[PDB]
Amino acid sequence: AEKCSRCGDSVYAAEKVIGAGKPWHKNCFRCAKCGKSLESTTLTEKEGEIYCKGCYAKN
């Protein structure tokens, strides 16, 4: 397992998915910029790090 940074619990094989590079629950897609927790992989991905599509388009 590898630990989910948003919710604080360890993600085993629950809602475990890779977005950019890091393990994520599909509720817990925490943004590197603004920190808004997002849905599945629908947003913008950078190298091993995620950023919202809306917040990164603004920034």
Question: Is 33 a residue that touches Zn ion (CB under 5 A)?
Answer: yes
Question: Is 14 a residue that touches Zn ion (CB under 5 A)?
Answer: no
Question: Is 7 a residue that touches Zn ion (CB under 5 A)?
Answer: yes
Question: Is 25 a residue that touches Zn ion (CB under 5 A)?
Answer: yes
Say how far apart CA 52 and CA 33 lie, in whole Å.
8
Q: What is the CB-side half-sphere exposure of residue 37 using CA atoms within 13 A?
A: 9
Question: Is 52 a residue that touches Zn ion (CB under 5 A)?
Answer: yes
Residues of this chain that interact with Zn ion (CB under 5 A) are 4, 6-7, 25, 28, 31, 33-34, 36, 52, 55
